CSV table of N, CA and C and ligand atoms in Angstrom, one decimal:
chain,number,residue,atom,x,y,z
A,1,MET,N,18.0,133.5,29.6
A,1,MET,CA,18.9,132.3,29.9
A,1,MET,C,19.4,132.5,31.3
A,2,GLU,N,19.6,131.4,32.1
A,2,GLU,CA,20.2,131.4,33.4
A,2,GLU,C,21.7,131.2,33.1
A,3,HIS,N,22.5,132.1,33.6
A,3,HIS,CA,24.0,132.0,33.2
A,3,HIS,C,24.9,131.2,34.1
A,4,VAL,N,25.1,130.0,33.8
A,4,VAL,CA,25.9,129.1,34.6
A,4,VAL,C,26.6,128.2,33.6
A,5,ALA,N,27.9,128.0,33.7
A,5,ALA,CA,28.7,127.2,32.7
A,5,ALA,C,28.7,125.7,33.1
A,6,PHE,N,28.5,124.9,32.1
A,6,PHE,CA,28.7,123.4,32.3
A,6,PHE,C,30.0,123.2,32.9
A,7,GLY,N,30.0,122.3,34.0
A,7,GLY,CA,31.3,121.9,34.6
A,7,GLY,C,31.9,122.9,35.6
A,8,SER,N,31.1,124.0,36.0
A,8,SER,CA,31.6,125.0,36.9
A,8,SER,C,31.8,124.4,38.3
A,9,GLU,N,32.9,124.8,38.9
A,9,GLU,CA,33.4,124.2,40.2
A,9,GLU,C,32.3,124.3,41.3
A,10,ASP,N,31.5,125.3,41.3
A,10,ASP,CA,30.5,125.6,42.4
A,10,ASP,C,29.1,125.4,41.9
A,11,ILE,N,28.9,124.6,40.9
A,11,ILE,CA,27.6,124.4,40.2
A,11,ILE,C,26.5,124.0,41.2
A,12,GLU,N,26.9,123.2,42.2
A,12,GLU,CA,25.8,122.7,43.1
A,12,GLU,C,25.3,123.8,44.0
A,13,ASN,N,26.2,124.8,44.3
A,13,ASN,CA,25.7,126.0,45.1
A,13,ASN,C,24.8,126.9,44.2
A,14,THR,N,25.2,127.1,42.9
A,14,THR,CA,24.4,127.9,42.1
A,14,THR,C,23.0,127.3,41.9
A,15,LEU,N,22.9,126.0,41.7
A,15,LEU,CA,21.6,125.5,41.3
A,15,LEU,C,20.8,125.2,42.5
A,16,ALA,N,21.3,125.3,43.7
A,16,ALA,CA,20.5,125.1,45.0
A,16,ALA,C,19.3,126.1,45.1
A,17,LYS,N,19.5,127.3,44.5
A,17,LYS,CA,18.5,128.4,44.5
A,17,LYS,C,17.4,128.2,43.5
A,18,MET,N,17.6,127.3,42.6
A,18,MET,CA,16.6,127.3,41.4
A,18,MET,C,15.4,126.4,41.6
A,19,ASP,N,14.2,126.9,41.2
A,19,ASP,CA,13.0,126.1,41.2
A,19,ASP,C,13.0,125.5,39.8
A,20,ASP,N,12.0,124.6,39.5
A,20,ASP,CA,12.0,124.0,38.2
A,20,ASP,C,11.9,125.0,37.0
A,21,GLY,N,11.2,126.1,37.2
A,21,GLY,CA,11.3,127.1,36.1
A,21,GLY,C,12.6,127.7,35.7
A,22,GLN,N,13.5,127.9,36.8
A,22,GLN,CA,14.8,128.5,36.6
A,22,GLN,C,15.7,127.5,35.9
A,23,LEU,N,15.5,126.2,36.3
A,23,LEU,CA,16.3,125.1,35.8
A,23,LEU,C,16.0,125.1,34.3
A,24,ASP,N,14.8,125.4,33.8
A,24,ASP,CA,14.6,125.4,32.4
A,24,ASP,C,15.3,126.5,31.6
A,25,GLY,N,15.9,127.4,32.2
A,25,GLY,CA,16.7,128.5,31.6
A,25,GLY,C,18.1,128.2,31.4
A,26,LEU,N,18.5,126.9,31.8
A,26,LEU,CA,20.0,126.6,31.7
A,26,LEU,C,20.4,126.2,30.2
A,27,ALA,N,21.7,126.4,30.0
A,27,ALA,CA,22.2,126.2,28.6
A,27,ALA,C,22.5,124.7,28.3
A,28,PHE,N,22.2,123.8,29.3
A,28,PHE,CA,22.5,122.4,29.2
A,28,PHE,C,21.5,121.6,30.0
A,29,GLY,N,21.4,120.3,29.7
A,29,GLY,CA,20.5,119.4,30.3
A,29,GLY,C,20.8,119.2,31.8
A,30,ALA,N,19.8,119.2,32.6
A,30,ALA,CA,20.0,118.9,34.0
A,30,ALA,C,18.9,118.1,34.6
A,31,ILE,N,19.3,117.0,35.3
A,31,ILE,CA,18.4,116.0,35.9
A,31,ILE,C,18.8,115.9,37.4
A,32,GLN,N,17.9,116.0,38.3
A,32,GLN,CA,18.1,115.7,39.7
A,32,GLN,C,17.6,114.4,40.1
A,33,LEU,N,18.4,113.5,40.7
A,33,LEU,CA,18.1,112.1,41.1
A,33,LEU,C,18.2,112.0,42.6
A,34,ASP,N,17.3,111.1,43.2
A,34,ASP,CA,17.5,110.7,44.5
A,34,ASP,C,18.6,109.6,44.6
A,35,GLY,N,18.9,109.1,45.8
A,35,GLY,CA,19.9,108.1,45.9
A,35,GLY,C,19.5,106.7,45.3
A,36,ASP,N,18.2,106.5,45.0
A,36,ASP,CA,17.8,105.3,44.2
A,36,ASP,C,17.7,105.5,42.7
A,37,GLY,N,18.1,106.7,42.2
A,37,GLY,CA,18.0,107.0,40.8
A,37,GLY,C,16.6,107.4,40.3
A,38,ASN,N,15.7,107.8,41.2
A,38,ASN,CA,14.4,108.3,40.7
A,38,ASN,C,14.5,109.8,40.4
A,39,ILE,N,13.8,110.2,39.3
A,39,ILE,CA,13.9,111.5,38.8
A,39,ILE,C,13.1,112.6,39.6
A,40,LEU,N,13.8,113.5,40.2
A,40,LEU,CA,13.1,114.6,41.0
A,40,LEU,C,12.9,115.9,40.2
A,41,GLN,N,13.8,116.2,39.2
A,41,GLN,CA,13.8,117.4,38.4
A,41,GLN,C,14.4,117.0,37.0
A,42,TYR,N,13.9,117.7,36.0
A,42,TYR,CA,14.3,117.3,34.6
A,42,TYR,C,14.0,118.5,33.8
A,43,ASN,N,15.0,119.2,33.2
A,43,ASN,CA,14.8,120.4,32.6
A,43,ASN,C,14.5,120.4,31.1
A,44,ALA,N,14.1,121.6,30.6
A,44,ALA,CA,13.7,121.6,29.2
A,44,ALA,C,14.8,121.3,28.2
A,45,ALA,N,16.1,121.7,28.5
A,45,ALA,CA,17.3,121.5,27.6
A,45,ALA,C,17.5,120.0,27.5
A,46,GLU,N,17.3,119.3,28.6
A,46,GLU,CA,17.4,117.8,28.6
A,46,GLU,C,16.4,117.2,27.6
A,47,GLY,N,15.2,117.7,27.7
A,47,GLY,CA,14.1,117.1,26.9
A,47,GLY,C,14.4,117.5,25.4
A,48,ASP,N,15.0,118.7,25.1
A,48,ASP,CA,15.4,119.0,23.7
A,48,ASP,C,16.4,118.0,23.2
A,49,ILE,N,17.4,117.6,24.1
A,49,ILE,CA,18.4,116.6,23.6
A,49,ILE,C,17.8,115.2,23.4
A,50,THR,N,17.0,114.8,24.3
A,50,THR,CA,16.6,113.3,24.3
A,50,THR,C,15.3,113.0,23.8
A,51,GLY,N,14.4,114.0,23.6
A,51,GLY,CA,13.0,113.8,23.2
A,51,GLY,C,12.0,113.5,24.3
A,52,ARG,N,12.5,113.3,25.5
A,52,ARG,CA,11.5,113.0,26.6
A,52,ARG,C,10.8,114.2,27.0
A,53,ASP,N,9.5,114.0,27.4
A,53,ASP,CA,8.7,115.2,27.9
A,53,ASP,C,9.1,115.3,29.4
A,54,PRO,N,9.6,116.5,29.8
A,54,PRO,CA,10.1,116.7,31.2
A,54,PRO,C,9.1,116.3,32.3
A,55,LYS,N,7.8,116.8,32.1
A,55,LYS,CA,6.8,116.5,33.1
A,55,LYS,C,6.5,115.1,33.3
A,56,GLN,N,6.6,114.3,32.2
A,56,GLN,CA,6.2,112.9,32.3
A,56,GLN,C,7.2,112.0,32.9
A,57,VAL,N,8.5,112.4,32.9
A,57,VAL,CA,9.5,111.4,33.4
A,57,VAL,C,9.8,111.7,34.9
A,58,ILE,N,9.3,112.8,35.5
A,58,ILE,CA,9.5,113.0,36.9
A,58,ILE,C,8.8,111.9,37.7
A,59,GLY,N,9.5,111.3,38.6
A,59,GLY,CA,9.0,110.1,39.4
A,59,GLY,C,9.4,108.8,38.9
A,60,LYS,N,9.9,108.7,37.6
A,60,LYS,CA,10.4,107.5,37.1
A,60,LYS,C,11.8,107.2,37.5
A,61,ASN,N,12.2,106.0,37.4
A,61,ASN,CA,13.6,105.6,37.7
A,61,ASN,C,14.5,105.7,36.5
A,62,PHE,N,15.5,106.5,36.6
A,62,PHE,CA,16.4,106.8,35.5
A,62,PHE,C,17.0,105.5,35.0
A,63,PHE,N,17.5,104.7,35.9
A,63,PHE,CA,18.3,103.5,35.4
A,63,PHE,C,17.5,102.3,34.9
A,64,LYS,N,16.3,102.2,35.5
A,64,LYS,CA,15.5,101.0,35.3
A,64,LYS,C,14.6,101.3,34.1
A,65,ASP,N,13.9,102.5,34.2
A,65,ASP,CA,12.7,102.8,33.3
A,65,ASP,C,13.1,103.7,32.0
A,66,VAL,N,13.8,104.8,32.3
A,66,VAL,CA,13.9,105.9,31.3
A,66,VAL,C,15.2,105.6,30.5
A,67,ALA,N,16.3,105.2,31.1
A,67,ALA,CA,17.6,105.2,30.4
A,67,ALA,C,18.3,103.9,30.6
A,68,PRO,N,17.8,102.8,30.0
A,68,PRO,CA,18.4,101.5,30.3
A,68,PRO,C,19.8,101.5,29.7
A,69,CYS,N,20.1,102.3,28.7
A,69,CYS,CA,21.5,102.3,28.1
A,69,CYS,C,22.5,102.8,29.1
A,70,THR,N,22.1,103.4,30.2
A,70,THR,CA,23.1,103.9,31.2
A,70,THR,C,23.2,102.9,32.3
A,71,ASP,N,22.5,101.8,32.2
A,71,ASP,CA,22.6,100.7,33.2
A,71,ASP,C,23.8,99.8,32.8
A,72,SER,N,25.0,100.3,33.3
A,72,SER,CA,26.3,99.7,32.9
A,72,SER,C,27.2,100.2,34.0
A,73,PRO,N,28.4,99.5,34.0
A,73,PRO,CA,29.3,99.9,35.1
A,73,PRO,C,29.8,101.3,34.8
A,74,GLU,N,29.9,101.7,33.5
A,74,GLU,CA,30.4,103.0,33.1
A,74,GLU,C,29.6,104.2,33.4
A,75,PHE,N,28.3,104.0,33.8
A,75,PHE,CA,27.5,105.1,34.1
A,75,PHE,C,26.8,104.8,35.5
A,76,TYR,N,25.8,103.9,35.5
A,76,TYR,CA,25.1,103.5,36.8
A,76,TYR,C,26.1,103.0,37.8
A,77,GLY,N,27.2,102.3,37.4
A,77,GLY,CA,28.1,101.8,38.4
A,77,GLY,C,28.8,103.0,39.0
A,78,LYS,N,29.1,104.1,38.3
A,78,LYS,CA,29.8,105.2,38.9
A,78,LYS,C,28.8,106.0,39.8
A,79,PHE,N,27.5,106.0,39.4
A,79,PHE,CA,26.5,106.6,40.3
A,79,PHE,C,26.3,105.9,41.6
A,80,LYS,N,26.2,104.6,41.6
A,80,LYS,CA,25.9,103.9,42.8
A,80,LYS,C,27.1,103.9,43.7
A,81,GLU,N,28.3,104.0,43.2
A,81,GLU,CA,29.5,104.1,44.0
A,81,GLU,C,29.5,105.5,44.7
A,82,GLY,N,29.1,106.5,44.0
A,82,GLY,CA,29.0,107.8,44.6
A,82,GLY,C,28.0,107.9,45.6
A,83,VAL,N,26.8,107.3,45.4
A,83,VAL,CA,25.8,107.4,46.5
A,83,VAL,C,26.2,106.6,47.7
A,84,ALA,N,27.0,105.5,47.5
A,84,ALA,CA,27.3,104.6,48.7
A,84,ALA,C,28.3,105.4,49.5
A,85,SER,N,29.2,106.1,48.8
A,85,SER,CA,30.4,106.8,49.4
A,85,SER,C,30.0,108.2,50.0
A,86,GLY,N,28.9,108.8,49.6
A,86,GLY,CA,28.5,110.1,49.9
A,86,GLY,C,29.3,111.2,49.3
A,87,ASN,N,29.9,110.9,48.1
A,87,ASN,CA,30.7,111.9,47.3
A,87,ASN,C,30.7,111.4,45.9
A,88,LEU,N,30.5,112.4,45.0
A,88,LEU,CA,30.5,112.1,43.5
A,88,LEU,C,30.8,113.3,42.7
A,89,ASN,N,31.8,113.2,41.8
A,89,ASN,CA,32.1,114.3,40.9
A,89,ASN,C,32.8,113.7,39.8
A,90,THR,N,32.1,113.4,38.7
A,90,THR,CA,32.8,112.8,37.5
A,90,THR,C,32.3,113.2,36.2
A,91,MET,N,33.1,113.3,35.2
A,91,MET,CA,32.7,113.8,33.9
A,91,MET,C,33.2,112.8,32.8
A,92,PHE,N,32.3,112.4,31.9
A,92,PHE,CA,32.7,111.5,30.9
A,92,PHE,C,31.8,111.6,29.7
A,93,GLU,N,32.3,111.1,28.5
A,93,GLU,CA,31.4,111.1,27.4
A,93,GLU,C,30.7,109.8,27.3
A,94,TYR,N,29.5,109.8,26.7
A,94,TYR,CA,28.6,108.7,26.6
A,94,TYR,C,27.7,108.8,25.4
A,95,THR,N,27.2,107.6,24.9
A,95,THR,CA,26.2,107.7,23.8
A,95,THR,C,24.9,107.3,24.3
A,96,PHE,N,23.8,108.1,24.1
A,96,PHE,CA,22.5,107.8,24.5
A,96,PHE,C,21.8,107.2,23.2
A,97,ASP,N,21.2,106.0,23.3
A,97,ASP,CA,20.7,105.4,22.1
A,97,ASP,C,19.5,104.6,22.3
A,98,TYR,N,18.8,104.8,23.3
A,98,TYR,CA,17.5,104.1,23.5
A,98,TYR,C,16.3,104.8,23.0
A,99,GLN,N,15.8,104.2,21.9
A,99,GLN,CA,14.5,104.7,21.3
A,99,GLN,C,14.7,106.1,20.8
A,100,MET,N,15.9,106.4,20.3
A,100,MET,CA,16.3,107.7,19.8
A,100,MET,C,17.4,107.6,18.8
A,101,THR,N,17.7,108.6,18.1
A,101,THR,CA,18.9,108.6,17.3
A,101,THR,C,20.1,108.6,18.2
A,102,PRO,N,21.1,107.8,17.9
A,102,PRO,CA,22.3,107.7,18.8
A,102,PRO,C,22.9,109.1,18.9
A,103,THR,N,23.0,109.6,20.2
A,103,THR,CA,23.5,111.0,20.4
A,103,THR,C,24.6,110.9,21.4
A,104,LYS,N,25.8,111.5,20.9
A,104,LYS,CA,27.0,111.5,21.8
A,104,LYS,C,26.9,112.8,22.7
A,105,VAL,N,27.1,112.6,24.0
A,105,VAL,CA,27.0,113.7,25.0
A,105,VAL,C,28.2,113.7,25.9
A,106,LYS,N,28.4,114.8,26.6
A,106,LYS,CA,29.3,114.9,27.8
A,106,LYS,C,28.3,114.9,29.0
A,107,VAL,N,28.7,114.0,30.0
A,107,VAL,CA,27.9,113.9,31.2
A,107,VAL,C,28.7,114.3,32.4
A,108,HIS,N,28.1,115.2,33.2
A,108,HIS,CA,28.8,115.5,34.5
A,108,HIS,C,27.9,115.0,35.6
A,109,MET,N,28.3,114.1,36.5
A,109,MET,CA,27.5,113.7,37.7
A,109,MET,C,28.1,114.3,38.9
A,110,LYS,N,27.3,115.0,39.8
A,110,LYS,CA,27.8,115.6,41.0
A,110,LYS,C,26.8,115.5,42.1
A,111,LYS,N,27.3,115.3,43.3
A,111,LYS,CA,26.4,115.3,44.5
A,111,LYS,C,25.8,116.7,44.7
A,112,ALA,N,24.6,116.8,45.0
A,112,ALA,CA,23.9,118.1,45.3
A,112,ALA,C,24.3,118.5,46.7
A,113,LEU,N,24.1,119.8,47.0
A,113,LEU,CA,24.2,120.3,48.3
A,113,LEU,C,23.1,119.8,49.2
A,114,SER,N,21.9,119.6,48.6
A,114,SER,CA,20.7,119.0,49.3
A,114,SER,C,21.0,117.7,49.8
A,115,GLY,N,20.2,117.2,50.7
A,115,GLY,CA,20.4,115.9,51.4
A,115,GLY,C,21.0,114.8,50.6
A,116,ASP,N,20.1,114.0,50.1
A,116,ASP,CA,20.3,112.7,49.4
A,116,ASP,C,19.9,112.9,47.9
A,117,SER,N,20.6,113.8,47.3
A,117,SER,CA,20.3,114.1,45.9
A,117,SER,C,21.5,114.3,45.0
A,118,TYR,N,21.4,114.0,43.7
A,118,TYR,CA,22.5,114.0,42.8
A,118,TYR,C,22.2,114.6,41.5
A,119,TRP,N,23.1,115.4,41.0
A,119,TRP,CA,22.8,115.9,39.6
A,119,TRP,C,23.4,115.2,38.5
A,120,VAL,N,22.7,115.1,37.4
A,120,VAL,CA,23.3,114.7,36.1
A,120,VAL,C,23.2,115.8,35.1
A,121,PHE,N,24.3,116.3,34.6
A,121,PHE,CA,24.3,117.4,33.6
A,121,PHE,C,24.7,116.8,32.3
A,122,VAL,N,24.1,117.3,31.2
A,122,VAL,CA,24.4,116.8,29.9
A,122,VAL,C,24.6,117.9,28.9
A,123,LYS,N,25.5,117.7,28.0
A,123,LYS,CA,25.6,118.6,26.8
A,123,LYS,C,26.0,117.8,25.6
A,124,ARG,N,25.7,118.3,24.4
A,124,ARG,CA,26.1,117.7,23.2
A,124,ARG,C,27.6,117.9,22.9
A,125,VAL,N,28.2,116.9,22.3
A,125,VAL,CA,29.6,117.0,21.9
A,125,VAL,C,29.7,116.7,20.4
B,1,HC4,C1,20.0,105.3,27.2
B,1,HC4,O1,19.0,104.5,27.4
B,1,HC4,C2,19.8,106.8,27.6
B,1,HC4,C3,18.6,107.3,27.7
B,1,HC4,C4,18.4,108.7,28.2
B,1,HC4,C5,19.4,109.6,28.6
B,1,HC4,C6,19.1,110.8,29.2
B,1,HC4,C7,17.7,111.2,29.2
B,1,HC4,O2,17.4,112.4,29.7
B,1,HC4,C8,16.7,110.3,28.8
B,1,HC4,C9,17.0,109.0,28.3
């Protein structure tokens, strides 16, 4: 296991070192998005939570293609305000319910240290 706690204040520094293999060792779901919402990284714990195959969703658009239930002011609206502003750090509960059993999660969105990229972290509640 890679030892990093969900919601850690310096999480973006810790995950800057990780390749896709190391990201699969985390205790929670992790998705890296560009500023348009396309999926750059998607780890194994996320696929365990949602059923998606991590390899297959890389390159898809999270809000348009993969996760239409997040296309709402409560989730995508917070993302696009963070991208526009160049800062984002927010944590909230949400229900994922597209083509899956409805699953309640805690979501943390945070700007990456890397240029124009954004993390979405997820854990079951
Ligand atoms: C609602 O459509 C959510 C879908 C979803 C959330 C997170 C994922 O990793 C995959 C699909």
